[PDB]
Design a protein around this ligand. Structure first.
Ligand SMILES: [Zn+2]
Length: 118
RNA sequence: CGGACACGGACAGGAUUGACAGAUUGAUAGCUCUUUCUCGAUUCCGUGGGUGGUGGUGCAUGGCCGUUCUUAGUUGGUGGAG
């Protein structure tokens, strides 16, 4: 009840991510890839094939979420506002985490990993 | 572009930077073009609004300066005259 809800919220304050329409499928090619995330609403079955094309033979893990729009307020483009429109982003399908920096509640995302995926 | 901001759009399933090579230039200006790699919300676009100007107007002015003006000249108060 803690992995899907809140311990991926706290890995998002000022950490490394992908941003915009030119680097979502970019970060996979580097040897700094910690926990990444992919949306299970992707219109083509080739992009989701392409993110598992690297990580399934390597040390990198994706978590399948609903869509990328609900990840749009997770990347950093905050559009939910008091005098602002709560609908401005069409969010990202693949962001990574380069470095955590803080270790308050960062265990519970990797606790999900080696519990079934070993 | 060194067009700030403000709003809408464009906008992670494809906004924007940079650049080797060649006909391409006056020019090793990616200026543009053919082709392709690269940059990470930075911008780009429309609409308002700034802003810059050795642009106008010295007869819209300030300041400074020249001059009549290198000569002795000028002004109140209170009384006097009208
Ligand atoms: Zn003029």
């Amino acid at each position: 009840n803690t992995a899907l809800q809140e311990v991926l919220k706290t890995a998002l304050i000022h950490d490394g991510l992908a941003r915009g329409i030119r680097e979502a499928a970019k970060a996979l090619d580097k040897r700094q890839a910690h926990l990444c995330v992919q949306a299970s609403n992707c219109d083509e079955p080739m992009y989701v094939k392409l993110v598992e094309a690297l990580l399934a033979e390597h040390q990198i893990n994706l978590i399948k979420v609903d869509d990328n729009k609900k990840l749009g307020e997770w990347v950093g483009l905050c559009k939910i506002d008091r005098e602002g429109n709560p609908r401005k982003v069409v969010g990202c399908s693949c962001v990574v985490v380069k470095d955590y920096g803080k270790e308050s509640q960062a265990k519970d995302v990797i606790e999900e990993y080696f519990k079934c995926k070993k």
